[PDB]
Amino acid sequence: TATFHRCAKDPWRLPGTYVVVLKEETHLSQSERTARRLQAQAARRGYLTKILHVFHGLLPGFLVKMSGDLLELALKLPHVDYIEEDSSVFAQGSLVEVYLLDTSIQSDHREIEGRVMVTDFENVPEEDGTRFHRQASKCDSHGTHLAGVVSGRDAGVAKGASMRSLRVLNCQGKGTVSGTLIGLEFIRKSQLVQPVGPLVVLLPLAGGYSRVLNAACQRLARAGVVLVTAAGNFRDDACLYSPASAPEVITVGATNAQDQPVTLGTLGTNFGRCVDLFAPGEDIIGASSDCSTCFVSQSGTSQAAAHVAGIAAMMLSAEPELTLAELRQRLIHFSAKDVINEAWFPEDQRVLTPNLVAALPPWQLFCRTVWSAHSGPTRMATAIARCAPDEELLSCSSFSRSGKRRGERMEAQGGKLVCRAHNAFGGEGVYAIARCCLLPQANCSVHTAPPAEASMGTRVHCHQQGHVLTGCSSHWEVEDLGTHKPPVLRPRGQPNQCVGHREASIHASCCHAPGLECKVKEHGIPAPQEQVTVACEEGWTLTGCSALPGTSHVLGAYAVDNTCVVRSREAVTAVAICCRSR
Template sequence: MKEQLRRGAVLTALGLTGAVLFAPVVTAAPLEEAVLTASGAEAVPGSYLVVYKSGVQADATALATRYQGRLGRSFSSVIQGFSVRGLSEQQARRLAADPAVDYVEQDAVVRLQDTQTDPIWNLDRIDQRELPLDKKYTYDNTASNVTAYVIDTGIRKSHSEFEGRASYGYDFVDNDSDASDCQGHGTHVAGTVAGKTYGVAKKAKIVALRVLGCDGTGSFEGIISAIDWVTANGVKPAVVNMSLGGNGSNTTMENAVRKSITAGFTYALAGGNSGQDACQFTPARTPEAITVGAVDQAGKRSVWNSSASSNFGTCLDIWAPGTAIRSASYSSDTGSTEMGGTSMASPGVAGAAALYLGANPSATPKQVRDALVANATKNLLTDIKTGSPNLFLYTGSGGQNPNPPDPPAGKLTAATSPVSQTIGAGQFGSTTVAVQGGAGTVRLSATGGPQGAMYFFQPTTISAAGSSQLSVFTGFAAAGTYPIKITATDGVNSATTTFTLTVR
């Protein structure tokens, strides 16, 4: 798209030169490129995420200054780029057209995924298939060789639950090394992952990355910075828990999670508390991670109040306890409190992933996810909505569960998540295209959609059992519903799937 715009600009300039005898010289307007935005997301005004083209090395400070912005943070491990602040929408579009830049994406607000509520049943529940509870939690290892990275509000590392195993990574809110907790959410989450009383993996080491402030909010910029930090500095085997999220999609953050997973870090993500399709929320929609829904003591999808219940749908991988979960409190070194939310379900799964890595330290993130899914209790849950997997977290066989085999080579399948989306005119639509099977490199292409639509796959080629983010720019297409056909081919086999985009 950029190349076409630049070529058009050259032709216009030549036309003006040829007409100089007949009209005054006209100065060509600066080039502009569309900026990625997520439908429904709460934008951070003036803040943008900038990703370089592949192979480009640029001076981030100079590039930000050139377009009248100021440098926020630089990223180098999971993405190559930076954040910039103080830009108008027009300045952001001009930055997006810079030859060094692949794309620019609007930063947005991210929030906690918990709902406060008034013996610790969740541990009792996940080590047995059926009710009633047996008043025991049995585990075959403590994950003492595993590090759990908690990207959240920080932690109270002096809490007795952590037995000296907790430490600070970095505080991306205050930009210092003190990631202490002034909100409580992160301490509670860390206790569920690895507390001595409330934790699933009772001896795992804990490292806190603070990205959410005392009010429980933050931005994609801070979260990407934390993912970048973990990927550059993390010690494996490791799990990463992110009990947070925002509306819509964020290509930059989702790609950062993917790169970190590729680097060997297993991610557990909260599915969200809006009572909606988890595919409409980020980072929950990232297919390579383990995305978790919440259920109550009766095995029913968690409902905390009239406006808060667990998200559902095909983007979930598994369900775990998320109602009335007791864990460590940030108010004292010995206190505890109850919370509810997919924020509380996700760290239970992160702890289970740590147990698996405790017994299988060389396992890949995909093997960890597949093992937890294969070991889950099936067809037990109720009110989980159409499309959701009926799989409840089970740790009874701990790290001894064998990894299920990969799909046979040669049978190529493709699927989109979400399968449909509604956007406004001039906005980008997006979906994740996941393929299974096949042999070698898989290439992706898209056809259909409104006239003049442009398609961007990131990455453009993937391996079998991989995924790519498809962004669709509709221009100013007329309102309507447009099916988009996506084709995956490895040169021998091919598969198709559909993404339906509605322009309102």
């Protein structure tokens, strides 16, 4: 069960250096011993090996320069979880400290002087070209511009922000997964030996999907740190890149002044479910390393990330005890909705890409939609959409392009609820769409009601006093080999009850919360084209979204900010539950 991982993109691979990741509860003594064991064993087989660095703090492991001939030997070592081959990364009031993992910085620029501390940490790969020389260049450009966008006196977002620079990218704007890893461990170690102040980390870089890079980011995110990353500048799915694909980091895509996704020559901003929101990223004025008072116009998803890192720094200077779930939820809440022209993205990626452009703010119920990865085409294939640890799964829906679905289930998986969608017989696959919320003093629970083919017992609701229905899931409970007959809808008596087929099990989210009040909204169209919509009003927050009828006329349904969207084929009704606190 000790696995080897390498970058999917061959030209970004760096064979010869490997991150050996050990099992969770491994002390520094065991990491050193395991690295020494590998050195000795390699020496016995006649190979020189260099232990570049030993990881302690963020995750247990070590960095080793060795021939790939010795991999098979290293996989057999004791305590090894996995070995990942190194690969390259590329450049793309209270006191809040903002860490920046990027190039060098011109710290004496008027735009950022006195607000930027150069940490002395430096870990970069050597430049390509036998005769490459920086000459008059100080390799400050990218980092200086970004430090300016985050906190520059005149052109910055958070003009009251302390910054800390780590050099993780060389003159050519190239870094490695291993150098970033060391940079993150430096930050964790700083945080351990330094304050209980709010930390923001800006990762304006991207590489191919990396298991260890995402693991280290998750561990920093769970330690309280707020990670903001660039989505990537490859006009591709950001789930194929790291730290972009890490679910805990805030992944920012780029938009221009005409609310269009940014184009960078033949490529452009990355997209998909792993992007959290978009931010201004084309023709961005910021500090230039050319002179101490110069400005320059740069474009890309690092520019976009730096706006969000600035916004996060301002929100944190006001509310320093704010958690990462609260911060992410607040970011999504204050952004401009439906402004971006989705035409530029691939058609199958549009649904999955948020239509959100960051903005500053000008107790409360916050929700956000979380799409799963597509399931396999197997008939018993499932998609799983998970919320962040501090959030509540308030509803769960599913969507298939073919429309062949068994429905979905809100079930516990490791003590937390997840939204698990199920593919049907003959179906291509499905997505699970969770609705993750931050509800003040919630005691929420899901209750499963069985299929109701009898004349009574059909109404499913939160029968408990003080508990209110926030969302319904429906899962088709007829075996695939069974005689298929057209589904029958459960009659409608009360307004606040789950809508569903008599042949389906119903999962009902019931919340008991101090000022929580929750209502239902419907909207039907007889013969619609493409879709049906019903939206909550100002003040109300969408918590559930369901379609009516089933597979026959529907592809699925999903939340789009505070709009419930049902996708039809060529009496479709969108049922929404709107919810609010105090």
